[PDB]
């Protein structure tokens, strides 16, 4: 699976934040372990939370569940993710990843991230 | 006492299921003829415990699944069958049914045990 | 790192012995094996397993031979005991209207026997064949009078064969070798799980195998040591040879009562010159199927060497003589006819036959029985599948090797349809590394 | 259908585990033999079923215990034993250590329950 | 080894429980009477077992319940039974009361399933 991140980059803080990862190899249907990372000077990695693409469901970090939200639409193999009340401390790098974690073998796929500055 | 709930309703005679299934395990020719009984008793008790372990239901009289419900097997009320049916007139309701059922509820709990092979927690 | 998983329903097995049962669709098979069978029985093709099979350490045979043995013993249990005949006889030869085929063959015999009361007797007159019937010092004896006693068999009770399937209890797998040219012994590589095999008919005979299965492709030689000459040959053919065996006289069956509710059977009157019992096959095709044998034997021997046949090599008259039941009958032919030949880089051929009804069945020493007469002209119709041959011990000498029927046990019968299956024990247990640990 | 998992994978064949488990329940002379494997068929399924009750894995098909894997029972990569071995082939490798392994699974159980007589909630 | 801890008092007697259960399962007269024995071993087995069932302790050797301790059934002090009894005198000592016992679990267990059926998640 091969992973690119997208969506602007420049982000007003009135507005909410729109991020949309491509999915290729596989199919986001079939899979779990979608998620969202962010890399930021003040922190190095903070998890953002997953969706589970068989079934639709997330979860999410607990101090960021408040204000946000992952969906998918599998027919163009897509993901994103979306934040609303997004301000100056929510500038960060974003990446698309996918953990792959269960009893016979563990991996990890990331792309290359996107930046925003709010 | 045994059997004494099979004029009651369904809900009624839920709350007797303990003493129906305490009463499952209580000459050459007579003494192999005793013996073939003996056996058999054994051999259904344990195909039906078999059963409740496959379908992830272990060491419970009242289990509960994940698999729905289907109007095809039969349209009927809560309060219906519940309150004004008897266990007897149930399982002539939808004896046509019980393979399917049993089917059903073994594949639900094949995919309860695929989920679990993940460590993700699939939320 | 990794922890224990333990997982139940392993598709794993082992070798193990088992009890199989028996299956089928006034015959004691039938009556027996009466637990039915399927309709169209399905078997699961095992993609990607190879299993290691051994024809000659099969143990489905031996449970076989052991049930079958039971069979007769049971079958036989409730009927007429014939302990009272086992008296003086004063015989004659038959020497009326007898061609020179037959001469000496049967003995025309009379005796005191009992009837329902005991204080009183009747003269009784009978036929018999020469076989059954030995010298005192005429006086005659029946041959199994200084051995053991000997039982009617039961005229309503059929030991005709049936296909009979042999099925695995719960717990236990059949696994089939489905490989075209498998000679019983290594490992197979197309091979299926099935509940019961295919029906087996279970023909009891000595040299030549009659009704069996064929083989497809060519003939199959099997065997244990090839290069051993105390161990026996199996050859499978894969073209049938027809065999049409008679008892052309029309023998007349009669009764006397023995004491309070047993009847016993003897022949009464034969009817018509007397001529000898024989066998028939194509003389054509008995040529052309053993010419196939023999290109299968150069294959083991060398195609620079001589492959010659010869009769057997001496013995009782049920090793020497091919031995099976025809219409009920026993019959004991002559097989000089046809292993007779040396191969080297219309008509039939007919085999005189002997019949005889004093049995010692199953190579014992007494339990014998005897078989009432048959009502009639006899004839029956049978399909030569296989052979069992022996090689003549031998050395390098001049290169020629000779192939004689052989004698062989019961058992051999039984393998040469078994060779296929074999018998396996489930174990769902196992365990293997993962990544999990105990939730809590 | 029954073992047609045989030639998979470990990992393919442990997903049709129950299909291996419900087929394991299904003259006097004669009738005596019956007997006898009607009753071994009962004593070696409860054998089996006694073991998973003693190690703490009753009611289950797939169960994680906390005995951790010896290198020198078998040294793979996990994806090795999973992805190109079937369980034919891993039962020959580790049939030398089957008993050792039982034999600490039986220990890390009665150590889980003696931790589970703490009350201190078990930190 | 197999009842070693036969003199053991009830605590250390606790400690190896599992030894005890390993060792409960393994001419026409005399292959009927080992039929016979065979059979009865299966029968008593799985009646202890179901009881385990009904009183919703299965697949466990130590199991808490919610029936009090009766002290008519015997007045002793906590660590006078664990720590100066054995186990054989433990059962002479309360043997009268087995089934009143073995009866108050049962009706406990049932009480514990009307209550599981009623979703507020309150006893
Ligand atoms: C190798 O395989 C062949 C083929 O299966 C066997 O040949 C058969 O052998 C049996 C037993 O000897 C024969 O059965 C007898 O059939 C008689 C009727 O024959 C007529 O009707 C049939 C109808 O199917 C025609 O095919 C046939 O040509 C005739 O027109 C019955 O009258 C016989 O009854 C006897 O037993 C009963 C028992 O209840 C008594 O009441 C009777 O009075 C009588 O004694 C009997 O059923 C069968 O017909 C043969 N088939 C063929 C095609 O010939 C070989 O025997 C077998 N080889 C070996 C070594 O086993
Ligand atoms: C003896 O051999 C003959 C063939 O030479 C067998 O008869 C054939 O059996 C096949 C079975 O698939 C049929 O399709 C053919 O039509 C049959 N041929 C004829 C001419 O009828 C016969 O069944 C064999 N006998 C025994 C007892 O096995
Ligand atoms: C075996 O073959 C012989 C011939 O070799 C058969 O005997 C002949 O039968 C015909 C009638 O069909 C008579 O006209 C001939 O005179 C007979 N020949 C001899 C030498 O007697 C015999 O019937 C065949 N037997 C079987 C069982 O097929
Ligand atoms: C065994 O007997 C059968 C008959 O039951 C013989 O078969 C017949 O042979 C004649 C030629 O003589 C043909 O015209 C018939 O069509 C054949 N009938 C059948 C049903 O096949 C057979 O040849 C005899 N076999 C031997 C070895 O003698
Ligand atoms: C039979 O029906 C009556 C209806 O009034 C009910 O009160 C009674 O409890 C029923 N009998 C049983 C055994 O449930
Ligand atoms: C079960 O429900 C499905 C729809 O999910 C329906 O197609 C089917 O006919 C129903 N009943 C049976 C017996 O199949
Ligand atoms: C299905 O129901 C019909 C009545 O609607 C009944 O006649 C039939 O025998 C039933 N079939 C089965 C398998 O129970
Ligand atoms: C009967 O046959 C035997 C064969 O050995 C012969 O010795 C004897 O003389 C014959 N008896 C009569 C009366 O022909
Ligand atoms: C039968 O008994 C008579 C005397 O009643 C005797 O003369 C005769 O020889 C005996 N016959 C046989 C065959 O035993
Ligand atoms: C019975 O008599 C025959 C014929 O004389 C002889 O060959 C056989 O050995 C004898 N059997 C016994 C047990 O003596
Ligand atoms: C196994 O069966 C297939 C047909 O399904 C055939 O092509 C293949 O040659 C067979 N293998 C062997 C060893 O006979
Ligand atoms: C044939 O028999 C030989 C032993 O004589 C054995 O090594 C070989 O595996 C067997 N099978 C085949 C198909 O040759
Ligand atoms: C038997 O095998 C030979 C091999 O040379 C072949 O010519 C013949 O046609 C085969 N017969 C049958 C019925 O397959
Ligand atoms: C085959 O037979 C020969 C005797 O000629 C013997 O030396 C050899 O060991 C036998 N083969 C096997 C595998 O036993
Ligand atoms: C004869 O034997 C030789 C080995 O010496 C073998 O190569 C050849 O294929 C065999 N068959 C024929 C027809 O030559
Ligand atoms: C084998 O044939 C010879 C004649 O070549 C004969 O003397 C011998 O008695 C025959 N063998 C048997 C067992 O009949
Ligand atoms: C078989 O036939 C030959 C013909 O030469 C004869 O010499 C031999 O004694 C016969 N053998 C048997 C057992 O009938
Ligand atoms: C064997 O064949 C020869 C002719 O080559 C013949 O003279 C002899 O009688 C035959 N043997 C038998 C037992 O028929
Ligand atoms: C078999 O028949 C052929 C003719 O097709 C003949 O040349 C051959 O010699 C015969 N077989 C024997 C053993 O004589
Ligand atoms: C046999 O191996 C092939 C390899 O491509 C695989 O696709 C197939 O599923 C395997 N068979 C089984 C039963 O796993
Ligand atoms: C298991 O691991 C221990 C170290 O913890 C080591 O000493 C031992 O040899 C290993 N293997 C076996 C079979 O005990
Ligand atoms: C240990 O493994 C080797 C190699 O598979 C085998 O030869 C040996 O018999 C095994 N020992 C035991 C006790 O299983
Ligand atoms: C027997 O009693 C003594 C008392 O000091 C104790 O130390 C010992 O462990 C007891 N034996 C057993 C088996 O408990
Ligand atoms: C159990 O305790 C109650 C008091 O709470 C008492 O009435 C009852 O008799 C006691 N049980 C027995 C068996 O004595
Ligand atoms: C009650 O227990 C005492 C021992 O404390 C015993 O002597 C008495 O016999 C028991 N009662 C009955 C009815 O067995």
């Known amino acids: 699976v091969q992973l690119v991140e997208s969506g602007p980059g420049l982000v007003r803080p009135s507005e909410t934040l729109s991020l949309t990862c491509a999915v290729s190899?596989?199919?986001?249907?079939?899979?779990?372990?979608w998620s969202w990372i962010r890399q930021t000077p003040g922190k190095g990695l903070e998890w953002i939370g997953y969706?589970?693409?068989?079934?639709?469901?997330?979860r999410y970090n607990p101090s960021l569940q408040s204000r946000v939200t992952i969906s998918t639409d599998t027919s163009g193999n897509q993901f994103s993710l979306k934040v609303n009340s997004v301000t100056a401390a929510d500038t960060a790098k974003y990446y698309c990843?996918?953990?792959?974690?269960?009893?016979?073998?563990?991996?990890?796929?990331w792309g290359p991230g996107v930046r925003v500055t709010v | 006492g045994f059997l004494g709930a099979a004029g009651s309703t369904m809900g009624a005679a839920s709350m007797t299921l303990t003493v129906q299934a305490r009463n499952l395990l209580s000459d050459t020719h007579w003494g192999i003829k005793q013996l073939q009984a003996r056996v058999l008793a054994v051999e259904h008790y344990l195909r039906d415990q078999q059963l409740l372990g496959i379908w992830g239901c272990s060491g419970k009289l009242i289990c509960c699944t994940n698999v729905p419900w289907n109007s095809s097997w039969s349209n009927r009320n809560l309060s219906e069958i519940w309150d004004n049916m008897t266990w007897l007139q149930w399982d002539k309701e939808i004896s046509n049914y019980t393979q399917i059922i049993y089917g059903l509820l073994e594949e639900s709990q094949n995919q309860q045990e695929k989920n679990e092979q993940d460590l993700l927690e699939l939320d | 790192n990794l922890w224990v998983t333990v997982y139940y329903g392993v598709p794993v097995w082992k070798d193990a012995e088992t009890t199989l049962f028996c299956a089928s669709d006034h015959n004691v098979w039938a009556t027996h094996c009466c637990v039915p069978t399927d309709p169209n029985p399905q078997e699961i093709h095992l993609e990607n397993v190879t299993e290691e099979f051994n024809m000659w350490k099969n143990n489905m045979v031996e449970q076989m031979h052991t049930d079958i043995i039971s069979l007769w013993d049971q079958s036989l249990k409730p009927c007429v005991k014939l302990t009272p005949l086992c008296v003086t006889l004063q015989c004659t030869n038959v020497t009326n209207n007898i061609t020179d085929d037959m001469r000496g063959e049967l003995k025309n015999c009379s005796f005191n026997m009992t009837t329902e009361l005991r204080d009183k007797k009747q003269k009784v007159y009978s036929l018999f064949y020469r076989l059954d019937v030995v010298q005192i010092n005429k006086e005659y004896r029946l041959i199994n009078c200084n051995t053991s006693a000997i039982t009617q068999a039961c005229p309503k009770v059929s030991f005709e064969p049936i296909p009979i399937h042999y099925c695995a209890p719960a717990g236990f797998a059949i696994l089939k070798c489905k490989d075209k040219k498998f000679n019983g012994t290594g490992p197979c590589t197309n091979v299926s799980t099935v509940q019961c095999t295919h029906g087996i008919k279970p023909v009891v005979s000595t040299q030549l195998l009659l009704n069996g299965s064929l083989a497809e492709e060519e003939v199959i030689i099997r065997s244990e040591n090839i290069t051993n000459n105390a161990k026996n040959i199996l050859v499978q053919l894969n073209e049938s040879v027809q065999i049409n065996c008679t008892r052309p006289n029309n023998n007349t069956v009669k009764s006397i009562r023995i004491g309070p509710g047993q009847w016993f059977y003897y022949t009464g009157d034969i009817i018509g010159d007397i001529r000898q019992a024989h066998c028939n096959v194509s003389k054509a095709t008995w040529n052309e199927t053993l010419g196939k044998v023999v290109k299968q034997l150069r294959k083991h021997f060398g195609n620079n060497t001589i492959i010659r046949f010869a009769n057997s090599s001496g013995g009782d008259l049920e090793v020497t003589t091919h031995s099976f039941n025809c219409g009920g009958e026993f019959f004991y032919c002559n097989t000089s006819g046809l292993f007779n030949s040396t191969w080297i880089s219309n008509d039939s051929i007919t085999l005189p036959c002997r019949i005889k009804q004093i049995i010692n069945m199953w190579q014992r020493i007494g339990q014998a029985m005897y078989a009432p007469p048959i009502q009639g002209v006899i004839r029956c119709v049978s399909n030569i599948t296989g052979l069992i041959l022996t090689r003549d011990g031998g050395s390098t000498n001049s290169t020629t090797e000779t192939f004689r029927p052989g004698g062989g046990d019961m058992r051999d019968n039984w393998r040469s349809e078994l060779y296929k299956y074999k018998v396996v024990k489930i174990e769902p247990l196992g365990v293997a590394p993962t990544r999990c640990k105990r939730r809590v | 259908g029954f073992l047609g998992a045989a030639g998979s994978t470990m990992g393919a064949a442990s997903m049709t585990l129950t299909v291996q488990a419900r087929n394991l329940l299904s003259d006097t002379h004669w009738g005596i033999k019956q007997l006898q494997a009607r009753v071994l068929a009962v004593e070696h399924y409860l054998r089996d079923q006694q073991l998973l009750g003693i190690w703490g894995c009753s009611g289950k098909l797939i169960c994680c215990t906390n005995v951790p894997w010896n290198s020198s029972w078998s040294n793979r990569n996990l994806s090795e034993i999973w992805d190109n071995m079937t369980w034919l082939q891993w039962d020959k490798e580790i049939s030398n250590y089957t008993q050792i392994i039982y034999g600490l699974l039986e220990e890390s159980q009665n150590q889980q329950e003696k931790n589970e007589q703490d009350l201190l909630e078990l930190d | 080894g197999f009842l070693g801890a036969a003199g053991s008092t009830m605590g250390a007697a606790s400690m190896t429980l599992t030894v005890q259960a390993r060792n409960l399962l393994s001419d026409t007269h005399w292959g009927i009477k080992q039929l016979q024995a065979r059979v009865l071993a299966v029968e008593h087995y799985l009646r202890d077992q179901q009881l385990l069932g009904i009183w919703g302790c299965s697949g466990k050797l130590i199991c808490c319940t919610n029936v009090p301790w009766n002290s008519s059934w015997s007045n002793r002090n906590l660590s006078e039974i664990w720590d100066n009894m054995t186990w054989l005198q433990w059962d002479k000592e309360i043997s009268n009361y087995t089934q009143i016992i073995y009866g108050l679990l049962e009706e406990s267990q049932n009480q514990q399933e009307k209550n599981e059926q009623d979703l507020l998640e309150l006893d």
């Open positions: 969706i589970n693409g068989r079934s639709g469901s997330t």
């Open positions: 990843a996918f953990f792959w974690s269960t009893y016979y073998k563990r991996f990890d796929v």
């Open positions: 190899g596989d199919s986001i249907s079939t899979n779990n372990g």
